[PDB]
Structures are given as C-alpha cells and as structure tokens.
Design a protein around this nucleic acid. Structure first.
Ligand SMILES: [K+]
Ligand SMILES: [K+]
Ligand SMILES: [K+]
Ligand SMILES: [K+]
Ligand SMILES: [K+]
Ligand SMILES: [Mg+2]
Ligand SMILES: [Mg+2]
Ligand SMILES: [Mg+2]
Ligand SMILES: [Mg+2]
Ligand SMILES: [Mg+2]
Ligand SMILES: [Mg+2]
Ligand SMILES: [Mg+2]
Ligand SMILES: [Mg+2]
Ligand SMILES: [Mg+2]
Ligand SMILES: [Mg+2]
Ligand SMILES: [Mg+2]
Ligand SMILES: [Mg+2]
Ligand SMILES: [Mg+2]
Ligand SMILES: [Mg+2]
Ligand SMILES: [Mg+2]
Ligand SMILES: [Mg+2]
Ligand SMILES: [Mg+2]
Ligand SMILES: [Mg+2]
Ligand SMILES: [Mg+2]
Ligand SMILES: [Mg+2]
Ligand SMILES: [Mg+2]
Ligand SMILES: [Mg+2]
Ligand SMILES: [Mg+2]
Ligand SMILES: [Mg+2]
Ligand SMILES: [Mg+2]
Ligand SMILES: [Mg+2]
Ligand SMILES: [Mg+2]
Ligand SMILES: [Mg+2]
Ligand SMILES: [Mg+2]
Ligand SMILES: [Mg+2]
Ligand SMILES: [Mg+2]
Ligand SMILES: [Mg+2]
Ligand SMILES: [Mg+2]
Ligand SMILES: [Mg+2]
Ligand SMILES: [Mg+2]
Lengths: 203, 50, 116, 148, 116
RNA sequence: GCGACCCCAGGUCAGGCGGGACUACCCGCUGAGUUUAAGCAUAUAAAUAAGCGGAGGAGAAGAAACUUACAAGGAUUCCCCUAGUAACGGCGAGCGAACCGGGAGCAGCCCAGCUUGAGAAUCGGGCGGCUGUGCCGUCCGAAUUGUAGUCUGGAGAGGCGU
RNA sequence: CGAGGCGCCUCAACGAGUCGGGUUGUUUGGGAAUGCAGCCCAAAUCGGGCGGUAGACUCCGUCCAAGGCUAAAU
RNA sequence: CUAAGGGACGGGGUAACCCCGGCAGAUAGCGCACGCGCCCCGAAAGGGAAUCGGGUUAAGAUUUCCCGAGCC
RNA sequence: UACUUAUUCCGUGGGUCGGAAGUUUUGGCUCCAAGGCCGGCCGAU
C-alpha cells in the first residue's frame, strides 16, 4: 500500500519537494483553458476517498476560477437606498470557490453528473480544482451498484442545488446540534416554519 | 405595398377569407346563440398591424 | 518544414455506415400528380384561354414548382406543355397557366376532362 | 500543445531542483540496464492467452509455484515493507512524481537494492501493460543465482 | 370499402386500388367545380376510402418491419414512452446490491413472528 | 529507420447522453424600497418582493466531531408544549429560537485507506448463440498511476472450538 | 418438487490548503463574535472537536469532521 | 456584392441570464500523390448577366399575355 | 548589486537568433536552379 506515503507527502505543502512540483504545475495550468479534460487525476489517493474509480464512465476535469471577493455589479458603484446597503467592494460570495468550480463544470458538461471535486493548486489570482464527473449512460456505471444512485432522476445537477460536498459546506450542513439547527432541512424551510400563523379549528 | 414578402401575403389571404358573413343555416341549428360575425373588419377602420 | 507556418494535417475520415436505419418507413411521394393538379379553373376568363391561346388553367399545390407542373400534366392527361406560368392568387391558392404545344388542342383536352 | 511541452522542459532545467527530485536524473547505466532487462524478460508474467491455456491444461487433469516479476505500486510497496523485495526497479518518468519520489528512501531504509531506469513504458512492456512504473523481484531461479 | 377484404388483398392489388381511388377523387373535384348534386357526397366516401387503403398498407409495412428486425431496432420502431421512462434503470439494475448486502439478507432476513 | 509510451488534433466514424417547457409545493444564489420608529441615519419592512438557476412526486434532511449536568438521553422530518420565554435591540420602536417533555412515523447502510501475487480473481464493447430488462461463448479493449473481494470504529484482522 | 453467529486471546491503519486561528464582510436570538464567505497563517495522532463569557492551569462529562446513499410520518 | 454597422466559433469575464472580435487558436480549406494557405447578416435610391416595337382585358402587361424580332 | 525561467509589454504570414569557420542602379524584369559530382550530396559552411 503506497497511498499513505502519497497522502502524507501532500500534507507537507511547504517542503522543497512539494513547492517545486506545485510551482511547475501552476505555471502549466496558466497556459491552458479554464476548463480542461485530463486523462487521470493528479492526486489519485485524494480521488479514491471522494469516490473516483479507475473505470470507464469516470472522467476528471481541471477547473480554473478567479480568486477574491464579489464586487457588487452595479452600474457605477451607485446604490439607490439606505447607507446600510451602500457597500460595493468588500462583500463576499456565499458559495465557496470549490462549488463555483464544479458548477462551471456542470454547466459546460450537461451530459455528465458531478461526483465531487478536490483542491489542486492556486497562485494569487486563480484557484485550481479537479472535478470528478460520471457518465450515467455508460453500462459500467449503470451496472455498478455503488454508483447506480447517480443514475436516478433525483440527482440531476446536484452541483446547482448545493448537494455536493462543497455545497453542504456552504449550506451549513457540516455541523450538527445547536449552532447548525437553523440549516435543516434548509434555512428557508426553517424560516417559513417560524413565520407560520397556526390557526387551528379548535382555538 | 406592391412589393410584398410571401409571409405577409399568406397572412393577408387568410384575413380576406375570414371577414365574410356567417352562413344563414348556422342560425337554424338546434341550440344556436350566434347572431353575427363579431369579428368583421373593414380596411378603413381597425387596421391589422403587420 | 520549409514553412514557418503550421497547418493542421490532413487526416482520414470515414463515411457513415450505421448499424440500424434511423428511418425504416420507405418514404412516399405525398406531392404526387393528384396533389399537384387539384382541379382546373372554369371561370369566364379561364375559358377564354382555351380557344385563344391553347392554354389550360389549373389550381395547383403551393409546393409545386413549374417543373413538377409540366411533368404532372404529362402523366395525368398525356399532353405536352409548351410553358407554364404560375401565380399565387389573393385568396392564397396557386394558379397555373399551362400552354400546350402545337399539335395539342386544348378544346379537345377540355372536352375529355369535362370542363366544357 | 507543442509550445507548452517544450517550455515545460526548459522551466524544469532553469529552476533549482530539490535533491529528492534531482535523484531521478541519475539513471542506471546503459550496459547494466540492457543486462537487467534481458534478465527481467526471463520472468515475464504470462499473457492473457497463456493464462487461458494454463487454465485449460489444469482442467484436462480434472501445478508449481511460478517465479515472475511483481508490479503495481501498491503491491511492490507492500513487498518492500514486508522485507521480501530483492530488487526494485523504478521508472524515471512517473508524471505525478509524488507517486514514487519517496520510493528510493523507503528501499534504502529497508536495505533493499533499487535502481532508477529510463522508461515507464519499457517497464510496462515486460508485464504486458503500459507504464508499469515500478517492478519488483522477490525470487530468482537457481540457474540465475550467480547472474542475479 | 370493407377493410376486411382490403387486408386479404396483396400489395400489388392494394396499390392498384389506391391508384383507382385517386383517379376517381380527381374526377369528382372536376365535377364539384362544374356542376352536380349527388356526386358531391361521393367525395367524402372516396376520400375516406383512400385513407382506408393507406392505413392498411401502412399497418402491413410496420408489422413486416417489426418481424424483420426482431437486432438494433430502427428509431421509429422503438418503444415510445415518455422520455424519462426511457432513461430509467432496468429491474436487473434497480435490484442489484453488493455482496455485503446480499449476505445480510441470506443470513438475517426479517422473520415472521407473533406475541403470545 | 523500425518501435513503446505521453500529451494533443481531426472525423456526417459505431453506439449513446445534454440543452427547452410548466409553478402550487421543494433545493441554490442574488436582493430592495414603500412602511414603523409619530422626524431620521442603526434598527424595521426582510435574510421578504422583484431578478438568475435546479428537481421530484414529493423535495430537502438524515444515523452525532449531538445534547446535557440528569438516576442521564440517543439519526432525520412534522405537530403540541417550551414561548412571546433565554437572548438580541438608537436595550427605543421592536424582535426572538433552542434543550427537556408529549405525539405522528420509525431503519439503517455503502466506501477509501494494510489486507490476490500460487497467477485482475474485475469491467465495457463487437460478433454468435439462447431459455432474452438478462445468460453463455469467442475476440478486442479498459485497468497495476489499481477493477474485484475483505473491512468502516457499533468495529475489525489473525488464532482456537459449537 | 464456504461464509455468518456464538465463547475465549496479540495487532488494530479511520478522509489536509482540510481542521483550527486571525481579520474583513454578511447573517443570526447567539451576546470578547450563530452560520457562511473572501484573504492571510496553517495542523495533529499519549490526538482532534464540544460542555452558550474572552484567558492559563488541574480534573471531569461527551463526541470523532473534512467521502457517499437512505423509506415513513410532512 | 459589399458600406456605416450587427451577430458570432475558440478564448476571456460572469452565480447565471449574459457581456466582450483581435485576443491568434492544429481556422476547420483550395489547385492539379504534389503544390498553395497572410464565418455569416447588412442597400426593391450604392455596385450589378441579358428586351424591343406593335396588339390585346370589365378589371393586366407604364417591358410578365399575343404577334414579330432579338439577347444573356 | 547581478541573473532569468515566473509576470508584464512590443513585433512577425514566429523567415537567417547565439557561437565558430570562411543589391546606390536610369519610375525596367527577378519565383518553381543551371551546373557539377555519386533517388543522394554540393551549388545553398
Ligand atoms: K462479450
Ligand atoms: K479505517
Ligand atoms: K460573523
Ligand atoms: K477531549
Ligand atoms: K440592390
Ligand atoms: Mg386610416
Ligand atoms: Mg393593436
Ligand atoms: Mg412570377
Ligand atoms: Mg456516427
Ligand atoms: Mg432545464
Ligand atoms: Mg418615519
Ligand atoms: Mg408618519
Ligand atoms: Mg420622511
Ligand atoms: Mg421571488
Ligand atoms: Mg415530471
Ligand atoms: Mg432525498
Ligand atoms: Mg457512526
Ligand atoms: Mg433532538
Ligand atoms: Mg406561559
Ligand atoms: Mg427577524
Ligand atoms: Mg426544533
Ligand atoms: Mg421527547
Ligand atoms: Mg481511459
Ligand atoms: Mg482493493
Ligand atoms: Mg471477514
Ligand atoms: Mg476470530
Ligand atoms: Mg474567516
Ligand atoms: Mg466580521
Ligand atoms: Mg446577502
Ligand atoms: Mg461552562
Ligand atoms: Mg472524518
Ligand atoms: Mg459521511
Ligand atoms: Mg442526501
Ligand atoms: Mg401523508
Ligand atoms: Mg459574402
Ligand atoms: Mg464593416
Ligand atoms: Mg462565448
Ligand atoms: Mg447580403
Ligand atoms: Mg440598385
Ligand atoms: Mg393597370
């Protein structure tokens, strides 16, 4: 078993070995399009834990997304409203960069279904993720009882409904009990339940 | 104009057929409430904007 | 590489040889002669053309062009058209002026069809 | 695509390469490599047809322990830690280099002879695959004890 | 006329009937524009006969093709359902489970019991 | 020059998948102001309307990196109660849940990691056959940069017996 | 017409630019900071996350994240 | 056919709707294996293959039908 | 303070870069090699 050695090495990102290898790769990704199909995961050990298998029907894509916050896209920085809503520049997108990357991949590849994604690189302006997608029309997927669930119609475009691992992170579903109870079943479902005026017939 | 697209002429032909009086025997049917065409148009009034 | 410019090389491409036909119904000529030649015109203006210019007037399909018209009159009435003039009427239908070649008498053809 | 692969070779030449990566530059000598590979050809695993034929031959009766090269990174890594590897052959061009960059350290720590040879595709050909990326010898035949 | 007899006739006879009824509907459309009083109701009778013949010819063609193709089926011959039904997993695929789940059903299925 | 691989290119190549529509319910983003504060800027309106997307017959959630402080309970969801309460708030106007308890309904599972090496034992496709949502045979390919099987912390592997 | 259960006894592997911390914005009833997000720092394995007031030390209670599926009550 | 201009493959941006055409990307092909290689839309007043005279209807043809005579 | 490969900018139909060795004419034309030596080399380092 060699996967532990690979996993342990990738924990030392600040070593000379990992810094050199990441720097050459970061340069090469900069000369490629923002959505690129790759024949093999760069981090096979990290891909195994996230569900990837070396089978026909599993495909891997590298996605490049821009870093930083979300400037308000209003015509001149001009807001017509109260000063609490007049900020422009220091605002933040509610979804993470990992979900943005796999959401770009899902829109580009409508015939495939996103499994999940993992972090690959970053320099200053770009972050790189590799997204695992499944061809749910291939018989290898359709015959594997561990990935069969992805072929069912309720799992269409789960990256767009916040149902991947990255989506559960920004939805507040990576914790339980108090500090997280308002996010289940969803925050909007919780809010609607607390807005209800229950007028029973015997009151 | 004299210069017409085919699609404009085809629509003008249908509008020509549609502004006729209703047949007289329609008023004789068993449960009939139709009196007139209710959709006659005269070219000088009520232009069709094409 | 005598050129400093790279061009995409020429590669072999095969033709389509499907494993099953997408359409299995043969496909039937729905614009046959009976659709092309609907009926002749019998107005007073149309009847004048028979003895003045050896011409038969027909109501024809909108999809029928001049070539299909002369082929249709040949397969329907065994007569040869010298030329075909067509128009679309203000009622939306298509009207064809079919002038027969000399040695064909439209009045005799009109008698066989039944319009006279 | 041609420009990016040529610039990748130049960038790796200009940038200071850490020793754990620079060690893959030192490869087995050409004379030694042709000796080892001509001996590794003796212990090739059976191809698909040969395995099918051996299955049929057993079925006709209804064998012996074979001596073949071992391959696969997970399997070779397991053998080395179990102290059963007698020789480890590592390809010099594993594209994710973190797959085998620690391998010379593990083999040296476990007191196992190892070498780095040019060509994962050459290692793959021996085991009827493409890009084996590591080969292991645990046992050799008595006819080869002196040569090995 | 008498679709039961139409199903008996061969394909050459069925197309010969189709030709006759097309010639005869044309003779009526000529009569309709000139004059008549009881040839006008023949239009409905004969137009329906043309539909009747073409239905029989078509139904024979499809049944023949369905017999000749029982490998890959032509796209028009394939089972037409809703688009979502066609994308569904098979029962073999829906009922497949892995070994660790098949074992637990073999060794520990739900039992039939009662309380005294 | 013959070759092996890697990365990539072109195909009306063989077989396939996607785009749009619908609005009551559901999932994701984005996001006001009128209004109230007897003025008004925080606050409120409101994590609402509008705006951009994604599904299904339900959706989402879900099997503790949970509560508690007890003699402790034991996935998710919904109802009652908790409770107009703790808290928050020009502590102003206002706002505002959760635990316990009682009900409805109950169900727990699958992987990655070390774990074939006396044999990739796995999978797809073409073709043929048949007992036909599949099974078998043969030939190609995928895969060792890892398919199958074992294992998932409640464990488990190994050893010894019903 | 082999495997599992059970009784007894030396290994026992469990998910990383992730957790966590700082700061900035937003959101919350969550108040020396409820969740989320951007950026900077950046893990561990006699360890890690919690015990609704920030801190250090000593005990105690309690869980094991960062992979996936899951009917019913609605 | 091109004009002012418009759309638009790849690529870039963007939560998405959508916004960007010179940013150069193996430019997707043309002649006779060999040779070469610097998208569309947009004008019935711009550019532009080729027709004349006479006759004819209730209503056409100011060059479309008829007669004759040409042209591309 | 130096370096060049990141990054940035400029140019070209990416058409003679680095090291060594050894056409001024008058508003005209200039391409697809003659020749030499064995498809091949020089001519055209
Ligand atoms: K087969
Ligand atoms: K484990
Ligand atoms: K905060
Ligand atoms: K603890
Ligand atoms: K023009
Ligand atoms: Mg007017
Ligand atoms: Mg109007
Ligand atoms: Mg005309
Ligand atoms: Mg095809
Ligand atoms: Mg849609
Ligand atoms: Mg006020
Ligand atoms: Mg007031
Ligand atoms: Mg006011
Ligand atoms: Mg709305
Ligand atoms: Mg539906
Ligand atoms: Mg669900
Ligand atoms: Mg658990
Ligand atoms: Mg609870
Ligand atoms: Mg009370
Ligand atoms: Mg509120
Ligand atoms: Mg609650
Ligand atoms: Mg209770
Ligand atoms: Mg592949
Ligand atoms: Mg395995
Ligand atoms: Mg076991
Ligand atoms: Mg035991
Ligand atoms: Mg932060
Ligand atoms: Mg803050
Ligand atoms: Mg917001
Ligand atoms: Mg406390
Ligand atoms: Mg974990
Ligand atoms: Mg999980
Ligand atoms: Mg779920
Ligand atoms: Mg119900
Ligand atoms: Mg043009
Ligand atoms: Mg222009
Ligand atoms: Mg675009
Ligand atoms: Mg044009
Ligand atoms: Mg002009
Ligand atoms: Mg006139």
């Amino acid at each position: 078993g060699a996967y532990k050695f690979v996993s342990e090495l990738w924990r030392r990102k600040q070593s000379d070995v990992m810094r050199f290898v990441q720097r050459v790769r970061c340069w090469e990704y900069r000369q490629q399009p923002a959505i690129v199909r790759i024949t093999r995961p760069t981090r096979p050990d990290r891909a195994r834990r996230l569900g990837f298998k070396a089978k026909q029907g599993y495909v891997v894509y590298r996605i490049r997304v821009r870093r930083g916050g979300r400037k308000r896209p209003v015509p001149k920085g001009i807001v017509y409203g109260k000063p609490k809503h007049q900020g422009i520049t220091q605002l933040k997108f509610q979804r993470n960069k990992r979900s943005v990357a796999e959401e770009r991949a899902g829109r580009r590849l409508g015939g495939l279904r996103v499994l999940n994604s993992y972090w690959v690189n970053e320099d200053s302006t770009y972050k790189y993720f590799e997204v695992i997608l499944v061809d749910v029309a291939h018989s290898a997927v359709r015959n594997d009882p561990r990935i069969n669930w992805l072929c069912k119609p309720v799992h269409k475009h789960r990256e767009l409904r916040g149902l991947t691992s990255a989506g559960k992170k920004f939805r507040g579903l990576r914790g339980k009990g108090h500090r997280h109870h308002k996010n289940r079943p969803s925050r909007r479902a919780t809010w609607k339940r607390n807005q209800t005026v229950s007028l029973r017939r015997y009151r | 104009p004299s210069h017409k697209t085919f699609r404009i002429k085809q629509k003008l032909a249908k509008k020509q057929r549609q502004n006729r009086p209703i047949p007289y025997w329609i008023r004789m049917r068993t449960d009939n409430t139709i009196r007139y065409n209710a959709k006659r148009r005269h070219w000088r009034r009520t232009k069709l904007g094409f | 590489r005598t050129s400093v410019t790279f061009h995409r090389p020429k590669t072999l491409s095969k033709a389509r040889d499907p494993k099953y036909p997408r359409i299995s119904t043969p496909g039937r000529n729905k614009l046959d002669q009976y659709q092309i030649l609907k009926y002749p015109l019998t107005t007073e203006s149309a009847m004048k053309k028979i003895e003045d210019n050896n011409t038969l007037v027909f109501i024809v399909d909108l999809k029928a062009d001049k070539k299909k018209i002369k082929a249709a009159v040949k397969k329907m009435y065994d007569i040869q058209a010298k030329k075909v003039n067509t128009l679309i009427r203000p009622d939306g239908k298509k009207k064809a002026y079919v002038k027969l070649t000399p040695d064909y008498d439209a009045l005799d053809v009109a008698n066989k069809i039944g319009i006279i | 695509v041609v420009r990016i692969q040529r610039q990748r070779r130049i960038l790796k030449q200009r940038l200071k390469v850490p020793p754990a990566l620079h060690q893959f530059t030192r490869t087995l000598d050409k004379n030694l490599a042709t000796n080892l590979f001509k001996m590794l050809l003796k212990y090739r695993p059976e191809d698909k047809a040969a395995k099918k034929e051996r299955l049929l031959k057993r079925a006709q009766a209804e064998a012996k322990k074979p001596i073949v090269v071992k391959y696969g990174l997970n399997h070779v890594t397991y053998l080395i830690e179990q102290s059963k590897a007698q020789l480890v052959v590592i390809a010099h061009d594993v594209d994710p280099i973190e797959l085998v960059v620690w391998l010379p350290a593990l083999c040296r720590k476990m007191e196992v002879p190892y070498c780095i040879v040019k060509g994962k595709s050459r290692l793959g050909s021996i085991v009827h695959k493409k890009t084996a990326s590591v080969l292991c010898l645990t046992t050799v035949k008595n006819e080869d004890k002196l040569e090995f | 006329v008498k679709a039961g007899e139409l199903w008996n006739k061969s394909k050459d006879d069925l197309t010969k009937q189709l030709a006759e009824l097309k010639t005869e509907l044309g003779q009526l459309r000529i009569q309709k524009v000139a004059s008549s009083g009881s040839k006008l109701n023949r239009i409905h009778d004969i137009r329906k006969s043309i539909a009747r013949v073409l239905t029989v010819i078509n139904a024979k063609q499809r049944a023949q093709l369905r017999l000749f193709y029982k490998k890959y089926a032509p796209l028009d011959l394939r089972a037409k359902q809703t688009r979502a039904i066609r994308r569904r997993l098979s029962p073999d695929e829906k009922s497949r489970v892995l070994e660790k789940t098949k074992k637990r059903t073999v060794h520990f299925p739900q039992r039939k019991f009662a309380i005294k």
